[PDB]
Amino acid sequence: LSVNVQSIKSNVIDVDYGEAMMNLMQVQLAYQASLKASTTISQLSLLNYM
Amino acid sequence: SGVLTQDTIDKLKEAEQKARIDPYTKKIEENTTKQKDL
């Protein structure tokens, strides 16, 4: 019975590392590029001052 | 680690097994012990 609840406990609270990290990655993909994009955005801004 | 984590989880699959069958087995050895000596 304890094992049953322990299993049920785990089912509820514990995360899957792969699914979560994978989803961490998918967000990080867009996020990280946006960071490099932000730099580029500024770089274009600084261009027209000859 | 991907599949390895899943396989690690498969090796934990067996962890519940031994967690499960051992209690079964713990009274099987008395089943066998007190059957054999009988």
Swiss-Prot record, chain B:
It comes from the Bacteria. It is found in: Secreted; Bacterial flagellum. Belongs to the FliD family. Homopentamer. Required for the morphogenesis and for the elongation of the flagellar filament by facilitating polymerization of the flagellin monomers at the tip of growing filament. Forms a capping structure, which prevents flagellin subunits (transported through the central channel of the flagellum) from leaking out without polymerization at the distal end. This is Flagellar hook-associated protein 2. It comes from Campylobacter jejuni subsp. jejuni serotype O:2 (strain ATCC 700819 / NCTC 11168). The lineage of its organism: Bacteria, Pseudomonadati, Campylobacterota, Epsilonproteobacteria, Campylobacterales.
